[PDB]
Amino acid sequence: CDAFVGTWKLVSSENFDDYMKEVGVGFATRKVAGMAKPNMIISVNGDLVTIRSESTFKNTEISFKLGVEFDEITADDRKVKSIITLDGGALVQVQKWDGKSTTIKRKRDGDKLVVECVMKGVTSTRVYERA
């Protein structure tokens, strides 16, 4: 996942509130998520990949190996089982909890890192560029 390594800053967000509503995120948390201007910092050390999200409002970090299930507490405070794979050159994360699932796809497109979050056909698109 060398293509993904770096510090990325948010440049656009589309349909994020509706996505969060579909997942079940509370009103106040959606408000915070909507106004935050996060950086996404991706690094690799051998077979261990780390993805950090940082803003004045919230900091999250996951460290994982491709294709190995791990436990995660999400930014919106869900406890999920996550599996991340490299699928068509994209990093694809599936989160499962309470019999539900959502997919977060991170892809490289030109100079952009495009993040697509989908649940039950509701999709948010958040685009990042190098900081």
Ligand SMILES: COC(=O)c1sc(-c2cccs2)cc1NC(=O)/C=C\C(=O)O
């Ligand atoms: C279902 O809930 C989510 O998808 C939440 S809550 C949240 C928060 C940030 C700060 C407080 S809560 C961020 C996200 N998600 C993305 O932020 C996912 C895409 C990204 O990395 O840009």
